[PDB]
Amino acid sequence: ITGTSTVGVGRGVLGDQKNINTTYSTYYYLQDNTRGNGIFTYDAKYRTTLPGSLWADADNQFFASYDAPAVDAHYYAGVTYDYYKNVHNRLSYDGNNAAIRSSVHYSQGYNNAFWNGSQMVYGDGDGQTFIPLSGGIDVVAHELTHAVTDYTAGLIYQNESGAINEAISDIFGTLVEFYANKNPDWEIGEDVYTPGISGDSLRSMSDPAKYGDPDHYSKRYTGTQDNGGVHINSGIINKAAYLISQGGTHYGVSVVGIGRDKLGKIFYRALTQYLTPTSNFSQLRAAAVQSATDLYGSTSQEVASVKQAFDAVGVK
Numbered sequence: 222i223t224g225t226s227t228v229g230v231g232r233g234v235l236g237d238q239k240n241i242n243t244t245y246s247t248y249y250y251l252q253d254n255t256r257g258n259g260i261f262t263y264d265a266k267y268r269t270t271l272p273g274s275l276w277a278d279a280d281n282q283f284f285a286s287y288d289a290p291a292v293d294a295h296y297y298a299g300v301t302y303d304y305y306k307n308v309h310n311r312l313s314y315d316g317n318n319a320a321i322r323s324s325v326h327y328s329q330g331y332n333n334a335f336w337n338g339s340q341m342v343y344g345d346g347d348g349q350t351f352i353p354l355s356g357g358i359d360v361v362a363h364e365l366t367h368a369v370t371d372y373t374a375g376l377i378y379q380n381e382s383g384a385i386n387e388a389i390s391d392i393f394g395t396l397v398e399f400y401a402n403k404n405p406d407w408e409i410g411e412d413v414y415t416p417g418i419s420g421d422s423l424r425s426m427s428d429p430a431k432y433g434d435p436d437h438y439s440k441r442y443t444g445t446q447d448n449g450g451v452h453i454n455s456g457i458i459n460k461a462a463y464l465i466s467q468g469g470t471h472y473g474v475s476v477v478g479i480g481r482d483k484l485g486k487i488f489y490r491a492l493t494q495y496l497t498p499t500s501n502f503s504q505l506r507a508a509a510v511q512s513a514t515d516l517y518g519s520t521s522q523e524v525a526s527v528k529q530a531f532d533a534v535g536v537k
């Protein structure tokens with residue numbers, strides 16, 4: 222909407238206070254004009270029609286329980302925009318500052334979040350498996366990264382390409398979580414998963430097997446559930462990414478870590494210059510090796526480490 226840029230204040234899902242960019246025209250709307258062509262947050266009102274209504278508030282204060290998922294979706298979309306712009310020189314998900322749209326309060330007891338082809342969508346959870354999912358910065362960045370993937374490599378959402386698609390979202394979700402630097406880790410969704418259980422998460426990149434996911438190509442799932450295991454087999458690539466960054470010895474294969482920034486540069490280049498809609502794991506290995514070669518040179522430690530990591534997870 223047309224209006225003047227303002228700064229509201231509120232509390233997120235975890236009870237933390239933050240400032241948010243809003244727009245004033247009669248009401249204060251969750252419309253952040255400071256980033257690209259805007260970040261817009263909508264109320265789905267417990268229903269499934271999308272996007273719902275642009276979030277309107279009378280006083281620019283967002284401290285109601287109902288406000289919390291909107292505050293975090295809006296704010297963490299901003300952080301994710303900043304990561305892509307500042308770290309990768311990418312302007313929004315399409316590279317041309319497309320408006321970023323999110324809807325919260327989707328459906329009832331909805332234990333998931335997704336990119337629907339046009340926007341991000343967040344359930345509130347059922348209060349047992351999840352609390353409102355926008356409370357996780359890794360979750361928000363995971364969802365926006367699906368949009369980046371769709372506009373770039375275009376990895377088809379099934380089987381190996383789909384598992385790469387998922388891993389790309391977990392990798393950048395995690396790198397955004399480190400960028401914001403609040404309780405960062407290599408776990409996925411820990412901030413909004415199972416409020417009654419401490420110390421767990423939906424997935425782990427450092428040890429995917431902790432939550433039943435494969436950490437070696439020999440353990441890949443090839444059934445039909447979960448689109449051919451896109452959230453399962455992602456563990457193989459998540460493990461490789463973790464090893465590239467942090468190092469370690471996995472099934473006897475030692476990897477020299479090169480750090481998060483270089484992991485991010487290598488995978489961003491692979492995503493945007495080499496991967497295609499049908500890439501499999503072997504082709505991802507080749508893309509990451511080529512990307513590291515471009516950035517650091519054929520004889521570099523970075524290239525050697527990428528090879529070590531894929532060797533470690535059984536991907537040739």
Ligand SMILES: CC(C)C[C@H](NP(=O)(O)CNC(=O)OCc1ccccc1)C(=O)NCC(=O)O
Nearest residue numbers: 333334335336337338354360363364410423452
């Ligand atoms: C980071 C998580 C908290 C949320 C994350 N959600 P996600 O991977 O975006 C869900 N994916 C999804 O719904 O894809 C199906 C789809 C939806 C809409 C259009 C096209 C395809 C997840 O791992 N979900 C688990 C699952 O769906 O099994």
Ligand SMILES: [Ca+2]
Nearest residue numbers: 278280282283
């Ligand atoms: Ca208010």
Ligand SMILES: [Ca+2]
Nearest residue numbers: 404405406411
């Ligand atoms: Ca964390």
Ligand SMILES: [Ca+2]
Nearest residue numbers: 359408409410
């Ligand atoms: Ca995390």
Ligand SMILES: [Ca+2]
Nearest residue numbers: 414415416418
């Ligand atoms: Ca938990």
Ligand SMILES: [Zn+2]
Nearest residue numbers: 363367387390
């Ligand atoms: Zn996903």
